[PDB]
Amino acid sequence: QAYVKLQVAAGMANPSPPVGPALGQQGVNIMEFCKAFNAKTDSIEKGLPIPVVITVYADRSFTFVTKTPPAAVLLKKAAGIKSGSGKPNKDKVGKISRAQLQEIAQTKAADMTGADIEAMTRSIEGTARSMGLVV
């Protein structure tokens, strides 16, 4: 019932220029969602984006459960780069160690629907490669 993940950094309260009508398309108010986000934030670090479930009920009171931070941002943070890569196979911008990736993987485990952390690690590695960083 109108569930979509679509938002930017958690520290930016009431993101109307990035999101705008996408969050306030249905009958729920713009103030509420922002407030909720803010509330969520207090238990975690600011700066990073965070996705969340938007099950918009008819009563104008929505249930919501946060997920892990975006795959990309986390990956970036271990790398230590702002812009990833333009034309990655021709010239390499940076590179990552596997141990770090593995470490990163383990912390997400709650949201990750999988028993094996190895799998997660390899997924992360793949993602990194795609971005443009030879492991």
Binding site: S16, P17, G20, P21, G24, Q25
Partner: protein, 341 residues
């Protein structure tokens, strides 16, 4: 530490300058209204318009956002420095010293971006120096100008090449086409299109009278293989002439403007070159027209007697005439760029 100290303030100053140049308040205002519009859900019903709005917003945010970051980043750096000072620890101090560089670099990049607004600034270009009416003196002046420009190019790290040269019988040059080559050449040189007023006492004159000569420079970027428009075969005239058999002149009839080439050894090569030049010229003219639609020719006055050079439009004067002649004209060009003429 003194250099580090110097760097903190200087960076801030330059940021401030940049902001001023931008005239950021207007931009901010624009963003605000745009943001509001975006927030209203009826804008996305019409797609193209919505897209346009989105495009508008982001850039506005980003320039302004960049500025904000600079303001804030600088502050943070300052705070760090203060902390270091307070607590005699080496690592902190080192950090303070270092972190600032990146911000400065970013600022520089931003400035560069601001400077080179036009789409073809990055590409290499064709300088074209045609001498005045006067006579020998004019030719001499033209030659001098050419020399200056080549020296400037050399200083920059640009690969110069003479596409065409026509010589003056007594001295100097009647006219000369020069292909400059390198990164962002046109972005610098596009400003220096126009007439240049030399004023000096003529050695070619028997008497010691004081002569006033002119010479146009005209700069156009290389746009070959990218642009869709092509010259109509009927309007294009090819023409051959002797070197000083090999050389080729091209003529366009509707606009009534020509371009030539004599640097290549065979005819075919020359003709192609001419065509390339001609198309570039056409492109330049079209863009100029467009600009005009959207919306005397003398740009600099080199007075060698009183020993002052003064770019007219910008209003920057210098007395080291010799230096300027030798290719130290960067200063003028940057000023011009800043002005945004």
């Amino acid at each position: 530490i003194n250099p580090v100290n110097n760097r903190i303030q200087d960076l801030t100053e330059r940021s401030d300058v940049l902001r001023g140049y931008l005239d950021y308040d207007a931009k901010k205002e624009r963003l605000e209204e745009v943001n509001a519009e975006l927030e209203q859900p009826d804008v996305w019903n019409e797609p193209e318009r919505a897209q346009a709005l989105g495009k508008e917003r982001s850039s506005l945010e980003a320039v302004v956002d960049t500025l904000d970051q600079m303001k804030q980043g600088l502050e943070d750096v300052s705070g760090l420095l203060e902390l270091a000072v307070e607590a005699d620890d080496e690592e902190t101090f080192n950090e303070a010293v270092a972190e600032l560089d990146a911000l400065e670099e970013k600022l520089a990049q931003l400035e560069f971006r601001r400077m080179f607004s036009g789409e073809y600034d990055s590409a290499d270009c064709y300088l074209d120096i045609q001498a005045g009416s006067g006579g020998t003196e004019a030719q001499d002046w033209a030659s001098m100008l050419e020399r200056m420009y080549l020296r400037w190019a050399e200083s920059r790290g640009f690969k110069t090449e003479i596409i065409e040269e026509s010589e003056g019988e007594v001295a100097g040059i009647k006219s000369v086409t020069i292909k400059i080559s390198g990164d962002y050449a046109y972005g610098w040189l596009r400003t220096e299109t126009g007439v240049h007023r030399l004023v000096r006492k003529s050695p070619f004159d028997s008497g010691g009278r004081r002569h006033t000569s002119f010479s146009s420079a005209f700069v156009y970027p290389e746009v070959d293989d990218d642009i869709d428009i092509e010259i109509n075969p009927a309007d294009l005239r090819i023409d051959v002439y002797r070197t000083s058999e090999s050389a080729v002149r091209i003529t366009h009839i509707p606009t009534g403007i020509v371009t030539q080439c004599q640097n290549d050894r065979s005819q075919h090569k020359n003709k192609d070159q001419a065509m390339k030049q001609m198309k570039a010229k056409l492109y330049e003219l079209e863009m100029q027209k467009k600009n005009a639609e959207k919306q005397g020719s003398q740009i600099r006055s080199y007075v060698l007697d009183d020993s002052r050079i003064k770019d007219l439009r910008t209003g920057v004067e210098t007395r080291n005439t010799q230096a300027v002649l030798d290719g130290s004209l960067d200063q003028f060009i940057e000023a011009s760029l800043k002005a945004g003429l």
